[PDB]
Specification:
The structure is a homotetramer.
Chain A: H1 2-36
The structure holds copper (II) ion.
């Protein structure tokens, strides 16, 4: 019921936060590559 | 339940938007790398 | 309710599929940058 | 309940996993760029 839905929504949100963090890291790495190259 | 199916998905909506912004930022860096050849 | 849940889940899926597609485009652009250097 | 909600969020789980795979792929390209300087 609600509780199972709430768990899945929480798991989704966590995975999305992880994706955003990984993207922010990739962006910073590209800024580094831009300056060295 | 209605709250969760809209708000909670509310959290998911906001993380999706954050990811889309990061993707736009990454594309900006790639364009700048490609510009400098 | 049911079709409305299906609405938000379809909207999420579509945004996720768009994110995945832009990432696969980003991977290709990086692979080219790699093969240039 | 905790039966119908599964297939409900299955498409999203699969997209998340596909996104995570593309992130891994992007990081592979970034590591190879960094390797060659
Ligand atoms: Cu949901």
């Amino acid at each position: 019921g609600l509780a199972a839905i709430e768990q899945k929504h929480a798991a989704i949100k966590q995975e999305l936060a992880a994706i955003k963090q990984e993207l922010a890291a990739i962006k910073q790495e590209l800024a580094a590559i831009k300056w060295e190259g």
